[PDB]
C-alpha cells in the first residue's frame, strides 16, 4: 500500500478521537494499586515480545508471531504498524476520562468553598491508559506465551466498573483484591488451557464454578431475588451453549461472559432505578443506549476470530482477512476503535447515573 | 553416570535435611500477600520454561537453555535433573521453619492460658517454600527471558528479614510494599540490562542511586550516626569496585550487595546489643557465627559463574565445570545446599535474638 494510506489512517484515527475533545470543550462552553500490579505483570510480557520480534526479524522464520498477514502494514522494524496504531484511542480517549472527572472535581471543590468519591474514577482512567501501552506492546508480536494480557486487562477494568456499582451504597481494599483475584484467574485459565485440545474436564468444571460463583455473587448482593434467578438462568444458558457447541476457544468465551454480565449488571441497576420513583435523566438514558449499541458491534467484531493461537501457525493463517476500513485497518483494529468508545460510554453511564438525586 | 549416583545423590540430600528434623526433635525432647504477588509473577515464567523445554526436546537445538552441559544428569524428559533436585532443601528445611515457629506459638498460647508477632515469621516460611517450587521450575530450562526470579526471590526474603529487624521497636503494610518495591526493581534492572553490553550510564546511575538509597535508609533508621557513616563508606567502596572493575554482570553484583548489607545489618544490631548492658545468649552467639561462616562459602560458590546468559550460548559453555560432590552435584547445586542452610540460620538468629529479655 502507498504512504497516503498511512496519512489517511493517522488523520482518521486522530480526527475521531479529537472530535470527543472538541465536543467536551463545546459542552463545557455551553489509586496506583492496579497500576503497580500489572507493571509487575506487563513488563515480563514486554521483554518476550521484543525478544521474539527480534528473532523474527533476523531468523527469517515467520511462524513465531500470530499476525494478520493478509493486512499488516510495516514501518521501521515493526511488522504490523496498524495494529499498534489502532490502540491510540485508549490513550487519547482514556486520558479524556481524567479531565472530565478532574473538571468535575475542581468544580465540586469550588462550589463547596449520592456519595462523592472521585478516587476510583482515576483508577479506571489510568487503567484505560495502560491499554494504550501494554495492548500496543502485545500486538508487536502476538503469541500464546504472551496472549493473556491483551484482553485480560479488559476484565480488570470491567471488575472495577462493577466495584463502583457495588459502592452505590457505601473501596480501596476490594480494588486490590479484584486486580489480584483476576490475576489468579488469568493463570488458572492458562493452566487449564495447556491441555485445551479436548479439555472435557475444563468444559464441565468451569460450568460448575460459573454456577457457584454467580450464586455467591448474587447472594452477596422480592425484586432482587427474582431478578438474580433470571440472571442465573440465562448465565447457565450461556454456559450450556459453551459446553455443547464449543466453536471457539475458552478465551473468546471469557470475554463474552464479562461484557454480557456487565451489560446485564448495567441494565439491572436501571430496573431498581425504574421501579423506584427516580426518573432517569436524558443524558444517562441516551448514554445507556449509546453505550449498549456500540458494545453490540464490538462483540460482533470480536467473534470474527482473525487469528487463532490454539492451533499451529499454518492453520491460523486460514482466518486472515484483508483491510476493510481505509485499506489500513482490519477487524481487530475496528474492535480497538469500538471497544475504546464502548468503554468510554460505559464510564459516562456511571458518572452521570445518580445526578438526578 | 550410573543410577547408583542417582541413589547416592538422593540419599545424601535427604540425609542432610532429615538430620535437622532429628536435631529439632532431640532438642524438643531435651500472610499471603507475598505468596500471591509472586504467584502473579512466577506463573508466566513457569509457562515459558515448559514451552522452551519442549522446543529443545523436539527441535534438537540445544542453544535455548543455559544448562551446565558438562555435568547435567537427565531423568525422563528433564535435561538437568540434579539442578531441580538441588532445591529440595528449600522445601524440607523451609518447612522446618514453620514447625519451630508453630511449636513456639502453641507453647506461647499454652503458657499464657519483646513484642510477640508470629505472623511475619510465617511469611518468611512460605517464602522459603516458594523457592522450592519456582527455583526448581526455573532450572528446568534457564534463559535470559526467565532469569530474574531464580535469585530475585532471595532479595524478597532478604527484605522481609530486614523488616522484622526494623520491627524491633513496634508490619503488614510494609511487607506488601517491600515485595512490590522489589518487583519494580527486578524489571528496572531488566530494562537497563537490555543494553548491558557497555552500559556505562547504568554503571554511574546505579552508583548514585545506591548512594542516595543508603543515606535515606540510614536517615530513616552518636553511635548510630557514626555507624551508618562507616556503612555508607564501605557501601560506596563496593560500588566503586563495581564501577571500576566490572568483572561480572550486574546480576551477580546485586545479590552480592544484598547479602553483605544483610550481614552488616545483622552485625550492627549486635553492636547496639553489645554496647548496651544486654548480653548475647550462647545460642544466638553461635548462630550468628554459624550463619555467617555458611554465608561465607555461599558467596564464594556464587561468584564461580558456571553459566553466563549475558553472552551467546556458545561462549557460556566455556565456564561449565564437572560435578564435584558425589559425581552428581555441581557448584550451583552446592550454592542451593548452602544458601538454604545459611538462610535457615539467618532466621534462627532473628527468632532467638531477643530471648534474653
Residue numbers in the entry:
A (entry chain B), B (entry chain A): 288 to 317, 450 to 532, 543 to 599, 602 to 652, 686 to 821
Sentences from the paper on this structure:
Human SIDT1 and SIDT2 are closely related members of the SID-1 transmembrane family, and have been implicated in various biological processes such as glucose and lipid metabolism, innate immunity, and tumorigenesis. Here, we present the cryo-electron microscopy (cryo-EM) structures of human SIDT1 and SIDT2. Both structures reveal an overall architecture of a dimeric arrangement composed of an extracellular domain (ECD) rich in β-strands and a transmembrane domain (TMD) with 11 passes, highlighting the remarkable structural congruence. Importantly, the ECDs of SIDT1 and SIDT2 bind synthetic plant-derived miRNA only under acidic conditions.
The TMDs of both proteins consist of 11 transmembrane helices and feature two pairs of conserved disulfide bonds that are essential for structural integrity. Notably, both SIDT1 and SIDT2 exhibit a potential zinc-binding site with three histidine residues within TMDs, which is responsible for lipid hydrolytic activity. Regarding the TMD, while the overall arrangement is similar in both SIDT1 and SIDT2, different transmembrane helices (TMs) contribute to dimerization. In contrast, SIDT2 relies more on interactions between TM2 and TM6 for dimerization. The electron density maps exhibited well-defined main-chain connectivity and side-chain densities in the ECDs, while the TMDs have relatively lower quality and resolution. Overall, while the ECD structure exhibits consistency, the individual helices of the TMD in SID-1 transmembrane family members show flexibility, highlighting the dynamic nature of these proteins in performing specific functions in membranes.
